[PDB]
Structures are given as structure tokens and as C-alpha cells.
Amino acid sequence: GGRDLPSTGFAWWSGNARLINLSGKLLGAHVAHAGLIVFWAGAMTLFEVAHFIPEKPMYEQGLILLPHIATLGWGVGPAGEVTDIFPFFVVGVLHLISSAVLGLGGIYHALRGPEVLEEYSSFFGYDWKDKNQMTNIIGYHLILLGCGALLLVFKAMFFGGVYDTWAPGGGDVRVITNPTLNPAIIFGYLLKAPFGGEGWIISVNNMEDIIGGHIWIGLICISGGIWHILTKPFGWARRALIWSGEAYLSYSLGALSLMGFIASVFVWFNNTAYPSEFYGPTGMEASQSQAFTFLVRDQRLGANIASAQGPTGLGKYLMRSPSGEIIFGGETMRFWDFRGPWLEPLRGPNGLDLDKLRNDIQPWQVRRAAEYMTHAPLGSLNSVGGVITDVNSFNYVSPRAWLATSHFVLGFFFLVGHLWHAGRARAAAAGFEKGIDRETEPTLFMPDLD
Amino acid sequence: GRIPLWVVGVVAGIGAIGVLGLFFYGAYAGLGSSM
Amino acid sequence: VELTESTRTIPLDEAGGTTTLTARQFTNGQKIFVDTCTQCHLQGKTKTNNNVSLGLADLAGAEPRRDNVLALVEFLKNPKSYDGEDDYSELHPNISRPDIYPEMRNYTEDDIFDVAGYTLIAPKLDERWGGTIYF
Amino acid sequence: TYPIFTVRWLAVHTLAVPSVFFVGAIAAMQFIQR
Amino acid sequence: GTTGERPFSDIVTSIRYWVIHSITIPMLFIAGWLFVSTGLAYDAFGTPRPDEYFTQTRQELPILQERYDINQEIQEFN
Amino acid sequence: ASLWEQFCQWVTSTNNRIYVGWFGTLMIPTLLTATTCFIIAFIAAPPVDIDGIREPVAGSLLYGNNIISGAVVPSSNAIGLHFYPIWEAASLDEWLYNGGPYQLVVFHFLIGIFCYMGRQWELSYRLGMRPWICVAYSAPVSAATAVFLIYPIGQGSFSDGMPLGISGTFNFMINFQAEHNILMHPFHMLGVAGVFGGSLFSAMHGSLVTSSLVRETTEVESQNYGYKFGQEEETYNIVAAHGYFGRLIFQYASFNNSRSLHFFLGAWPVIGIWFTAMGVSTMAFNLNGFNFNQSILDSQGRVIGTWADVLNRANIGFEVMHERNAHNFPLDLA
Amino acid sequence: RGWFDVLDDWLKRDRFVFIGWSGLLLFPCAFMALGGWLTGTTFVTSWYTHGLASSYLEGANFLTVAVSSPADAFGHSLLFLWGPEAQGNLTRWFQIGGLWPFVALHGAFGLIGFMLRQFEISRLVGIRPYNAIAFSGPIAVFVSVFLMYPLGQSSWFFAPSFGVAGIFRFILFLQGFHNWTLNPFHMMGVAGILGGALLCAIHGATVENTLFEDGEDSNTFRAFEPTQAEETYSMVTANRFWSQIFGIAFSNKRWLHFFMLFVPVTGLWMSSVGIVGLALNLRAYDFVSQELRAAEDPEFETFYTKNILLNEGMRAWMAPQDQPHENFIFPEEVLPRGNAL
């Protein structure tokens, strides 16, 4: 394998392109990178644990990995309070140790092992143009991916459960016993409009639906893996697609960009898979919590929060949504589709219920609204929390902000990568990725436009 | 008797990231840290 | 100037007494303030209810007045309304209720004293302390 | 047999000398407590 | 392509350069460090030290108001 | 030879005066719909209740606006992120009152410009060109998506999208500065680097080529007539340009490779706009610019103001007056 | 051999750093400007002129440091070191903002020196002086913004300060006090700068993607010789691509490269004209038709009227701290503000 520009045609800054047809060294690069990923998981988790203050809420400490563990129902109890730090520590250590095994394997394959696996094995040797084998690899991975989804299912059903923020009697780890197998609900979720009030799959709001989804996902992924191992690409797909390593990279880049945008939206809007007791309030929650907090204060001062018109003529604390639902007043009117386990007790069939808002408020609801309102996912780049005009004494940026901003940026740059590699794969398949041939420049044989 | 240029580049880069990281440390300590 | 002895001299009681926080105690009180109270008392305001702020006039108008160290320490042990009528233990952070306010459960009497002292000294270092939410 | 001192040498020092001086001064400031 | 001067790569890879610069660059760095840490820079530029922005007799900004006699205003501002 | 094949050949034809392509079969209807609705709205649309407090804003020329002040007003805050097509309104007048033209125009525009990017790739493919002009075009596409889609999504309302007008754009920027301190955001700083540098390099390259043109004309005619469209030979001496520029600064700060130079010219503003688009896109989730308010304290603990504090005073001034009737609670949470 | 010719020989030698006759005024002046800025941003305060910390020594960072403009009390005094204000006292000269006129005047003469260097090198090398002409845009901006704007105002105090956040303050000040975004001259400047960026990106991308296959490697950069007579990219293919994508395309490369100079340069000149207007408070602040109507018709609102309100808020909330010498005491009750917020 050439490791210079004269032997490969690729400069040092495009050096990893020299691995396109070196399957052994490419496999080494891949396993060592996987090692990097697992290393970060373990090391960052151990950092978060060493920096963790167990009594202080998770979203106040710059944590993004321990919230993921706690949502899975490890190390936490009711309302997300930490019972034991050891499960987080164990998760970190196991990732950190496995990272070394993957690093070794990667450095081995990248440096010492065969540069090309074609000779060595028919099983591991692949040619980019060999559609049957590339679909075999798709299939083996689809079966492991579906197995991982079923691993989530098993943890939620048979191995202690997962954190259900919607649990009766307060949020807590719950064992899911009736996951939603009904394909109408599960796939209906896929068919919901990605706009306010519906939210496509972002609006999944119960662990039963999430778990039933992962049973379907595991089943569909395992079936698709078996299909791809026992089949070959059909004619229409053989004709509409580019069959090359860079092409497959560009396809995966498009998929990754889509998933990055989706993850950004998920963490920003959904509080079921991302519980607010770990991730802090969504911005919709913080706005509604502000409206609620001053609803309670003013009501306790004796105001009629129902019949109090604001300076504009709309109700100061309560109004109607454009479809008539009773909602919180003020600019929060935009977040009237927000659902939260501390709010939903005060909602009637018509929306917010006056009888409930006048008699059934609880101190935990007021405390929760105060906490969520003061932890609005608003903050500066140097982590000065609250609105940008505030002074420097509050060190807080929401984990939702960090995760959403990061994955939007990564999704966008991966869309750019998709375009880069998809256009390059197309041009290289067609044979003009290196520039225009002077003798057969196509425009010289095309008629003038005018 | 010539020091390889890549070694000189590595040493200078380490020192430059060091001065930059010292300057970023000072953002959180001493003067101008808000505390 | 430096953080003088007169700057850290604050009323301990209503009967006229005065105490002086040490620089270590002022720093500690500031640290607890930034770590536990700024989410709502940024720059002496009160985001969830700015009718009751941490400004010197406001602290002095409470019942009984809260512009001395001991009253503040009591308030952080057993918080009440602005008129001393209604129980606010389940509504305001305090050390008497570690079940609902776990963040405060490791703050000792010295720490609460320090944060009360800081709360009383901060208004002397900033004219905008205890103002309007936007100001 | 290149010359040691030239116009380029002075152009390099006029900037490099005060720059390292200033960098050390700004390094010292990182430890000033109020 | 070459204007006569020794190429920088030849200069910085040489023993004599580093024999000189292993002392010169650190000496400049420590000279600047000492300029700050001895308090010399405050006196040189008249920049207030952290305890001299406000004095006992003045709690407000020392904004200059004279057109000409500024030695006097800055002295009274202390 | 089939009719579908004939249609495919026409669509992908490189002999059409304007290339259509498959991406064009989407670009043309969407952009035409957006242009028609935009012109009609900008001229004649009735006032729009942007802030959802029943305070309609006049955006159209016939309602008293000039070209500078006219805009298509974003849809009502009461709508939020809800999808609001014409067939969800009980009358066109209700649709207009709530800012439906904004949703129609922006959605069709967004689709149209993504299709324009795809179309650029498509024509490059049909012409046997290299494929990355669309990558450069993805920078303005990203910025437009940030202001029309991502920022509304993060803030929770299409009412927070950039208005389709000049003064509406300034309002958006001012409000954005007041709530996010975009001036002190490093990604905006890279965007300013991108645009200042893009103009700098455009001027530099243009001036260096123009300075180094090969003598081909007489002094009575435009020097541009010294170039003939399709000529084999280069029209300026890059060697002379490099000699001048490498003496203006130093030899190693000048490009001798036109390919390397034209790459740099493309990459610098494109990267800078990608950063600024991502900056706007991340302040959509309220990850704002740097906050240095009261960062400097003296020994007693008194605040020594900096230029950032004065900037913060300007921001507070903007913030307390914006949407003067829309806030009922103390904190502007969105 | 006369001494003048011998001097012109040494000054115009081919060395790593060309000097020339222009260098006698470019190099000391640029070095004074740059060193003054670094010195002020590292060590010098704005405590006595602005009531602000403005150096690294006081705790400011790269974003917040500045060579701040002098105190208002000096008017447009040139604040020479030996002048009647500082009277040769270096420390007092630092404390009164004397570094601001030092950086501005050495920078102005350094910019003159750089343009003279452009002319001189152009003449020596034998090319047309269009790089020098292009640079007139930046000088127009520097002169109008850093000299003529404060010269028309009350003092150097209102000139932009040499700093990141100082410049941001100047920008927001021009918004809130001058409604500078509404100014057509600024709009032409925005069009020029954005169009310059657009032209840069689109020329670069077009050239890189219409390259002729001149080499065997994927690394297309190695396929260009600086002395080759042949164009390295297809102008015909580029022209057809843009003609079919955009409807129009460049067909003359000379006009294309002139346009790349003309657009940003013209934009800088136009914005400078607008700034010169702002020096005298000649602002495109208002549309009187809409002010008269909103005065008479309280239902009438546009984005323009909203921006007017934003400007009033900025002015009232920023004036007391931004202009500390005026002793603006604005009690809380007179500060304009919407509801709640």
C-alpha cells in the first residue's frame, strides 16, 4: 500500500483515501476509531463520576452521559435521586477497558496485519463492487443492531426497567410489562406531521410506546439482516445507485446527518426518553413553568387568574389556543402543546382546569415549576446561565442545549460530507472527478444555448 | 548536527498550546474571572 | 480599595450588635451563594418572586427584619412569608428539610452564617443589587 | 555562507523580541489575585 | 526564488541557533514576567492596581473634566 | 424510445436554455409558488398579528409601507410551530390575519433552494464537471435555513423567523443581539471574518489579475476586449502577479498555483458562512455569545466595567423595549 | 554615482522584506501603530477617560481589551505627548487616552505608506497599479470612520475604540443613535461586502470544479505550472453551467476579475460616504410619513416603527454608562420599557 503522493495520487491531507482499496488497513482504521469512541465513553463517564455531586441535580453539573445511564434505570431511584454511584462507575470502566482491546486490534490491523483481506479470507475479504458480499456485511450488522435494540427491551422488561418520568406517584424506575405492540400506534408515530402539536416521532410520550418500538425495530432489523444475507440487490437498485466505497460512505453520511438532526430535535423537545429530572427542563417546560409559577403566586395574592385580562386584552394567565384549548397566557402561548408530568395533573379534557388550578396545586408542583423556570435552557458560551443580559454569578448551561447544538452542527457538517462524497462518487464513477479532458470536453460538442 | 524540523515544530506547538491554555486558565482564575 | 474591615462589618442582631466576617468567610459565603442561590437570587434579585428581593430595603422591611445575620440564618433554617405568617419550609430552600432540598443538606451552621453575611455585604459592593429583574 | 545579520533579521527581531516579552508579562498576569 | 538570506528551516534546525535561543527567548519571557510581577507596569503606565480604582475620598468614576490641567485632576482623583 | 424515456431525456437535457433536471422538476414549482405569493403579499397583504396579542403589523406596500419598511410578516406566535396551510383557515382573511403567506413562502422557498443545490450538482454531472459548486452554495443555504427554519424551531415559533423584508431583517438582528449577544459569539466572528476576508480576497484577486493583464488592446478600447471567450491562452501573467504580491508581503505569503489560490478563494468565505450559520443555528437553542458582565472586580469586590458591560447596557435597552406588549412574566424564556 | 541613486539602489534591493522609499514611512508608522495597540491593550487603562478596564493587566480578555478613545474633555485635541495636556509626562499621556490618537495617526500614515508601497512595487515589477486602487476602499473606511466621524462629533471620545468589544460598542451605538442600518449608504456597503464574499466563493468553486484534467493524480493541485500558457480551467464549461443554472454567466474573464475588484471596493466607498453623513448627525433616521401616521393612527405599526422603539430603548439604557462625562442621571422611572420585561 502506497503511503505517499507519487504512489497513490492522494496528498497527505487526503491520506485516509489511500485506504479505500486496502481492506485490512481500512479495517484497522475502523477498529481503532471504534476504540476511540468507546474510550471516550468510558473516560468521559469516569470524569463525570469524579466530578459528580450526588445530591445536586444532574443537569446542574455539565453531565451528558450519566443522564443516559440514569434513564436506563441504573444508580437512581424515585424522582431521579442517586442511590449508588457504582453503576455509572462500572459502565465507565467497562468501556475504558474494552477501548484498549479495540485500540490493540486496530493498531494491529492498521500496522501489522494483512493490508488486503481478499487473499486471506472469502468471508472477510470484500470488493466494493461485490454487491452480494456488501449486502452480507449490511445483514450481519443489521442483526447485531436489532440485537442491541432488543437489549434495550430486555433491560426495560426483565432487568430492572427504565426511568419513567410519567410514573404514577412521581417519576421512578419502572419495569415495562405491556409494551405497545399495536403496529397502528407504533407506525402511526412515523406518519405524524413534524410540526407543532404532532411532532412526528419526537412526540413519543410513554415508555410502553418506546419499548414496543424497540421490539419492532429489533424484529425489522433482524429480518432485514437475514434478507440482505440471503438476497442480492435487485435490478432497479443496481441501476439507480452508485456501487463504490465512496458512494457507500456518502450514503452513510446522509443517514448520519438525518439522525443527527433527529437527535437534536429529540433532546430539545422530548422529556420522556430525556427525563427533565436528569436533562433539566425543555425550553417549552421552562416557559410553561414561568407562566405557572406566577399563576400560583398571583392567585395566592388573591388575583382571579381566570378573569384577569392582560394589557393586550388576552388573558394574563390563561387564554385559548387557536383550537380552543385552555392554555397558559403570555408568549408561552407558543408552547401550549407542552406535556409534563407536573403539569398534566392540572389539565382537564378542555385543557387547564380552573377547579384544579384553584384547589389541587401541590407544593412539589410549585417547587418543580420554580426549579424548571430558573433552569431554562438559556445560557452563554462561557456557561453564564439565564438570559444573556444577566451578570456573572450563575454557572449553568442546560445539557439539552449542549446536546442539541452539538448534534445539529454535526448533522449539518455530515450533510455537507454526504454532498462532498456523493458528488465525488458520482464523478469518479463517471470518470471526470480529476477534471475535464481537453480533447473530449463535452461542452465543445454541445450546441449553443442561443 | 541538525535538529529535525518536525521536532522543532512539535516543541513550538506544544509551547504555543501551553501559553494558550495558560491564558484560558486565567479566564477562570485571578483577575477577570468574576469571582 | 481592599475588602476592608468596615466592609465586612455587618449587623449581627437587631439589638445593635455587629460582627465582622473574615476574608475566608466572605469568600465561602460568596461560593455558596454562587453555587446554591444565584439560580434565583442572581445579583440580589428574585426571579420567581421579585416582590421579595435581597435588596437592603427589602431585607429590612421583613417581619422581623432580615437585615442582620441572625435573622437571615433563622430564615434559612425556617423560611416564612414577608410578614412572618405562612410556613415556607416546603417552598423555600432551607437546611431543616433535607428531603426536599438535598442540595443544602451538607451546609453547616458556619456555612449558613457565611452565606447570610455575604448576602448582607454584597449590596454594599453593587448599587444594582436587589433591583428590577431587568436593570 | 549566508550573512547572519540582514534586514530580514531585524524585521524578525523587532517583532519577536517585544512579543515574547509581552507574552511573559501576560503570563504573569494570569496569577494576579484581586 | 532565494533573495540571498539563509532559509529559516536551515536556521532553526541548527545547533547554534538553539544554543542562543534556549537562553534568549526564556530571558525575554522572564523579563516580561518580572515587569508585571514586581508591580513595575502599574507604575509605568499608571494603570490602577486592584485596590486603587476607588479610594476613601472617591467612590465614583474618575472621569477627566479639565481641558489642560490633568496632572492636577489625576492627583486629586488619587 | 418510450414516452417516459423521452421525457427523461428532455428533463435531463443539457441543451435546454435553462437546465431543468429532476431537482428542477421540484425547484421550479416551489420557487415559482414562493415568488408569486411573496410578490402578492408584499404588495397587498393585510396586517399580520405576528406577536399573537391582536396587534397586527402592516407589512405590505398598499397598507402604508415603503420598499424599505415593507415585509411579509412571520406567522402569529399563537400558531407557534403548527403547520398552517390555506386549507386550515376558515377564510383566506383569517389565513392572512395570522400570517399564512409567511409559512407558504418560506416552506416553498426552503424546498426550492435545497433543490437549487441539488440542481447545481445535477448539471455539473451532466456537463462532466467536478461536483462541488453545490458544496459552496450550501453555505448560504445553511444560513437561510438557520434564519427561516432552525431558529424558529429552537425558539418554538415561526413568529421568531426572519421577516421577509429589509426593516424586518434589522428587527430580527436587533432582537437577536438583545437575546443572544451574537456580536460576542465566536461563530458570528468567523462569519465576519468570512465576509470581510471574502471581500478582501475578491478585491485582491480581481486587482492582481487586472494589474497583470497581457497587453492585447489599444488605449482607445476597453481592456476587456483583450480577452476572447473560449481562448486557449491565459489573459494575465500569474508570474507577474506573484512577483508583485510576494514583494508586497514576502515571497512565501503569495500563491504561485492558481488551483491552490482558487481553492482558498472558495473555501474561506464558504467556511466562514458555515460557522455563522451554525452560530445562528445554535443560538436557536439559546447557547448564546460570550457573557463577560461583571467579570472584572476590584479587591473590595466592586465591578469595574469593560466594553462588554457597555454592550450589555445596549442589549438591555434593546431587550426591555422589544415586543413591548407581548411579555406578561419577568423572564423572556423564548 | 550620486548618493540619491545609491540610496535608491539599497532601498529597492531584492531582499526577504522589500523596503523601498515607501518603507521609510510605512515601517516606522505601522510599527508605532501596532506596538501602541499591543501596549495599550496589554497595560493601559481607560479608567480616567471612560471609567472602564481596557487592558489584560486589569483582567480584560482579547475580546474586551482596547485602546480606548480619549476623554471627551479634550475635544479633538491631537494629544501629542509634548502637547499641553500630557506635557511630556508619559504616564499621564497613557492615562488620558493619548495612545488612541497615537495609534490612529501612525496607522493613517502607515496606510498611506502601504498604498505608496503598492504603487512603488507595481512600478518596479511592471504591472498596472490596480491593487493600490483597490486598497482605496479600506483607506476611505479608515478615514471616514476613525477620523471624520469623530471630527464631526464632539471629540475623539466618540471615535471607535481599537478593540473587539470597543468596535461592537461603536456598531451598536451607531444603530441606536443613528439608525445606521436604515442608511442607504450602509445598505450599498452591505451589498458590496456580501457580494464580494459571494463572488469570492463562486469564482473559487467554479474554477476548482471546471479544472482541466492536466494530471494523473486525484490531487489536482499538482497539475498547474505557473509558467504554462494554457488556461487551467474551462471558461466555456463554466459559462454554460452558470448560463443554464443562473440564466446568465460571465463570458469575459477580464470583466469577471474587474467585477471582483469593483464590487467590494465600491461598497466600502459608499458606506464611507454614509459615515461621513453620520459625522454631522445627517442620518437616515426616520421615515417622516410613517412617523406622522403612527402619531395620528395608533393602530398603525411596521417593522420600521418597531426598530425606532428599539433605538429609543438602547439610547436611554446605554447613555449614562457609555458617556460617563455627561453625568447622565436617568432615574429608573424614566427608562422606557415594555410590559413586565
Ligand code: CLA
Ligand atoms: C481516527 C483517526 C485515524 C485512524 C485510525 C487512521 C488510520 C490510518 N491512517 Mg490516517 N490520518 C488521520 C487519522 C487517522 N488515520 C488524520 C487525521 C490524518 C491527517 C494528518 C491522516 C493521514 C494519513 C496519511 C497521510 C496516511 C494515513 C494512513 C493510515 C493507515 C496506515 C497507518 C500507518 O501506517 O501509520 C504509521 C504510523 C505510525 C507507525 C506512528 C504510530 C501510530 C500508532 C498507531 C500510535 C498509537 C498510539 C496509541 C496511544 C497506542 C495505544 C496502544 C494500546 C493502549 C492499545 C491507518 C489505517 C496511511 C495509509 O493510507 O496507508 C496506506 C497514509 O499514508 N493517514
Ligand code: CLA
Ligand atoms: C457531543 C459532544 C459533546 C457534548 C454535547 C459535550 C458537552 C459538554 N461537555 Mg464535553 N467533551 C466532548 C464532547 C462533548 N461534550 C469530547 C469529545 C471531549 C473530549 C475532549 C469532551 C471533554 C470534556 C471535558 C473535559 C469537559 C467537558 C464538559 C462539557 C460541558 C461543558 C462544555 C463547555 O463548556 O464547552 C465549551 C465550548 C467549546 C469549547 C466550544 C467547542 C467548539 C468546537 C470545537 C467547534 C467545532 C465545530 C465544527 C465541528 C468544526 C468543524 C470544522 C470543519 C468541519 C469545517 C457540556 C455538558 C465540561 C464539564 O462540565 O464536565 C463536567 C468539562 O470539564 N467535556
Ligand code: CLA
Ligand atoms: C470489526 C472487528 C474485526 C474484524 C472484522 C476482524 C477480522 C479479522 N481479524 Mg481481527 N481483531 C479485532 C477486530 C476485528 N477483526 C480486534 C478488536 C482485535 C484485538 C483483540 C483483533 C485481533 C486480531 C489478531 C491478533 C488477528 C486478527 C485476525 C483477523 C482475521 C481472522 C479472524 C479469525 O480468526 O476468524 C474468525 C474468528 C472468530 C470467529 C473468533 C473471534 C470472534 C471474537 C473474538 C468473539 C466475538 C467478538 C465479541 C467479543 C462479541 C461482540 C463484540 C461486541 C463489541 C458487541 C479477520 C480478517 C487474524 C489475522 O489477521 O489473520 C490473518 C489475526 O492474527 N484479529
Ligand code: CLA
Ligand atoms: C442500514 C440498513 C440498511 C441498508 C443500508 C439497506 C440497503 C439496501 N436495501 Mg435494505 N432493508 C433494511 C435495511 C437496510 N437496507 C431493513 C431493516 C429491511 C427490512 C424491512 C430491508 C428490506 C429491504 C428490501 C425488501 C429491499 C431492500 C433493498 C435494499 C437496497 C436498495 C434500497 C434502496 O434503494 O433504498 C432507497 C429507498 C428507495 C429507493 C425507496 C424510495 C423511498 C422514497 C424515496 C421515500 C423515502 C422516504 C424519505 C426520503 C425519508 C424520510 C425520512 C424518515 C422516514 C426517516 C440496498 C442495498 C432492496 C434490494 O435490492 O433488495 C436486495 C429491496 O428490495 N431492503
Ligand code: CLA
Ligand atoms: C465517517 C465519516 C467520514 C469518513 C470516513 C470520511 C473519509 C474520507 N473523507 Mg470525508 N468528510 C466527512 C466525513 C467523512 N469522511 C464530513 C462530515 C465532511 C464534511 C466536513 C467531509 C469532507 C471531506 C472533504 C472535503 C474531503 C474528504 C476526504 C475524505 C477522504 C480522506 C480523508 C482524510 O485523509 O482526512 C484527513 C484528515 C484531516 C486533514 C484532519 C481534518 C481536521 C479538521 C479540520 C478538524 C475538524 C474539527 C475537529 C472536530 C477538531 C476541532 C477541535 C479544535 C479546537 C482543534 C476519506 C475517504 C477527501 C477526499 O475526497 O478524498 C477522496 C477530501 O478532500 N472529506
Ligand SMILES: CCCCCCCCCCCCCCCCCC(=O)OC[C@H](CO[C@@H]1O[C@H](CO)[C@H](O)[C@H](O)[C@H]1O)OC(=O)CCCCCCCCCCCCCCCCC
Ligand atoms: C499538544 C500540546 C500540549 C497540551 C497540553 C498543555 C496545553 C495547555 C494546558 C494547560 C492548561 C492549564 C490546566 C489548568 C491548571 C490546573 C488547575 C485546575 O484544576 O483548574 C483550575 C480552574 C479551577 O478548577 C478547579 O480548581 C481547583 C483549585 O485549583 C481544583 O484544582 C479543582 O480540581 C478544579 O476543578 O479550572 C480551570 O481553569 C479549567 C479551565 C481551563 C483549563 C484548560 C484550558 C484549555 C487547555 C488548552 C486548550 C486551549 C489551547 C488552544 C490550542 C489550539 C489547539 C487545540
Ligand SMILES: CC1=C(/C=C/C(C)=C/C=C/C(C)=C/C=C/C=C(C)/C=C/C=C(C)/C=C/C2=C(C)CCCC2(C)C)C(C)(C)CCC1
Ligand atoms: C424505536 C422507536 C419507535 C419506532 C420507530 C420505528 C418504527 C422506525 C422506523 C423507521 C423507518 C421505517 C425508517 C425508514 C427510512 C426511510 C428512508 C431514510 C428512506 C430513504 C430513501 C432514499 C435515500 C431514496 C433515495 C433515492 C431516491 C429519492 C429516488 C431514486 C434515487 C435514490 C435511490 C437515490 C417509536 C417511534 C414507535 C417510539 C420511539 C422508539
Ligand SMILES: CC1=C(/C=C/C(C)=C/C=C/C(C)=C/C=C/C=C(C)/C=C/C=C(C)/C=C/C2=C(C)CCCC2(C)C)C(C)(C)CCC1
Ligand atoms: C506605544 C508607545 C511607544 C511604542 C512602543 C512599542 C513599539 C511597543 C511594542 C510592542 C510590541 C510589538 C509587542 C508585541 C506583543 C505581541 C503579543 C502580545 C503576542 C501575542 C501572541 C499570541 C497570544 C498569539 C497566540 C497564538 C494564536 C492565537 C495563534 C497561533 C498560536 C499562538 C499560541 C501563537 C513609544 C515607546 C514609541 C512611545 C510611547 C508609546
Ligand code: OEX
Ligand atoms: O416573538 Mn419575536 O422576540 Ca423570541 O425572545 Mn421571547 O419571543 Mn418574542 O420575546 Mn424576545
Ligand SMILES: [Ca+2]
Ligand atoms: Ca441549584
Ligand SMILES: [Cl-]
Ligand atoms: Cl421588536
Ligand SMILES: [Cl-]
Ligand atoms: Cl410572557
